[PDB]
Design an enzyme around this catalytic site. Sequence first.
Site, PDB file in Angstrom:
ATOM      1  N   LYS A  16       0.857  -1.214   0.000  1.00 27.97           N
ATOM      2  CA  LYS A  16       0.000   0.000   0.000  1.00 27.97           C
ATOM      3  C   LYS A  16       0.884   1.252   0.000  1.00 27.97           C
ATOM      4  O   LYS A  16       1.002   1.951   1.051  1.00 27.97           O
ATOM      5  CB  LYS A  16      -0.929  -0.046   1.221  1.00 27.97           C
ATOM      6  CG  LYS A  16      -1.997  -1.125   1.103  1.00 27.97           C
ATOM      7  CD  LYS A  16      -2.616  -1.221  -0.273  1.00 27.97           C
ATOM      8  CE  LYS A  16      -3.881  -2.051  -0.260  1.00 27.97           C
ATOM      9  NZ  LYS A  16      -4.939  -1.321   0.463  1.00 27.97           N
ATOM     10  N   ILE A  38       3.279   6.549   1.653  1.00 26.57           N
ATOM     11  CA  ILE A  38       2.307   5.514   2.065  1.00 26.57           C
ATOM     12  C   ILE A  38       0.951   5.879   1.480  1.00 26.57           C
ATOM     13  O   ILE A  38       0.534   7.046   1.318  1.00 26.57           O
ATOM     14  CB  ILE A  38       2.261   5.343   3.593  1.00 26.57           C
ATOM     15  CG1 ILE A  38       1.625   6.538   4.319  1.00 26.57           C
ATOM     16  CG2 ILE A  38       3.653   5.028   4.134  1.00 26.57           C
ATOM     17  CD1 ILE A  38       1.564   6.419   5.855  1.00 26.57           C
ATOM     18  N   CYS A  39       0.229   4.822   1.175  1.00 22.58           N
ATOM     19  CA  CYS A  39      -1.121   4.878   0.668  1.00 22.58           C
ATOM     20  C   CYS A  39      -2.023   4.425   1.783  1.00 22.58           C
ATOM     21  O   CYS A  39      -2.023   3.233   2.150  1.00 22.58           O
ATOM     22  CB  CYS A  39      -1.200   3.969  -0.548  1.00 22.58           C
ATOM     23  SG  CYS A  39      -2.810   3.988  -1.342  1.00 22.58           S
ATOM     24  N   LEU A  40      -2.742   5.395   2.275  1.00 20.82           N
ATOM     25  CA  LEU A  40      -3.673   5.171   3.413  1.00 20.82           C
ATOM     26  C   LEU A  40      -5.015   4.715   2.839  1.00 20.82           C
ATOM     27  O   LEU A  40      -5.329   5.028   1.678  1.00 20.82           O
ATOM     28  CB  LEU A  40      -3.807   6.460   4.209  1.00 20.82           C
ATOM     29  CG  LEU A  40      -2.519   6.998   4.859  1.00 20.82           C
ATOM     30  CD1 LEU A  40      -2.731   8.316   5.595  1.00 20.82           C
ATOM     31  CD2 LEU A  40      -1.885   6.009   5.800  1.00 20.82           C
TER      32      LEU A  40
END
Length: 165
Positions: free
Chosen positions: A109, A116-118
Site C-alpha cells: 500500500k 504511504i497509501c492510506l
Amino acid sequence: SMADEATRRVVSEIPVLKTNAGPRDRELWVQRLKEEYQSLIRYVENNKNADNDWFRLESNKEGTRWFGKCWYIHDLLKYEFDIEFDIPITYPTTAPEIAVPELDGKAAKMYRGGKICLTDHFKPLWARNVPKFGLAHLMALGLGPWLAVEIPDLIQKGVIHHKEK
C-alpha cells in the site's frame, strides 16, 4: 457513530490544535507550530506512559520539512524505519503525505517514491476535523494503522528482515 467513537478513543488525550496557518503564513505559522510541537510532545509522553514510544520527529528551522524514525514491534522484535514528510502550502486543511523511503518498491500500500497509501477513510476523517488535527494525529490515525497492516505483511512475505544488534 462507530467511526466517531473509534477516533475519540485514539485521540482524546492529544491536545487539539486551533490555528489555520500553513508554511507561508508568518506569525500565524509560528503560532501553529507552537500548537504542533505541544501536541506532539504530549503524544510522545502519553506513548511512553503506555509502553508504546514508537517514533521520534524533528523539523527544519521553519517547520516545513519533518523527518525522523518509527519503530514497529512484531513477535517482540523491534523494526526501525526512517520517515519524512513536507508540510503542504495548504496545511492544515490538506494533510501531509508521509514517506517511508526504505520501503519504496517493497510495501503493497505505497506509491512509487515511498509515500504511504492510506485507506480512503483517513482523508475524509482528517477533513471532518480541520483544523483540530495536526502532526500527532497524522501519526496516530495515519502512519500507526498503516504500519499495523503493512509491516506484518512484509515480515510474513520475507520482503524485510530483522538485522542482529
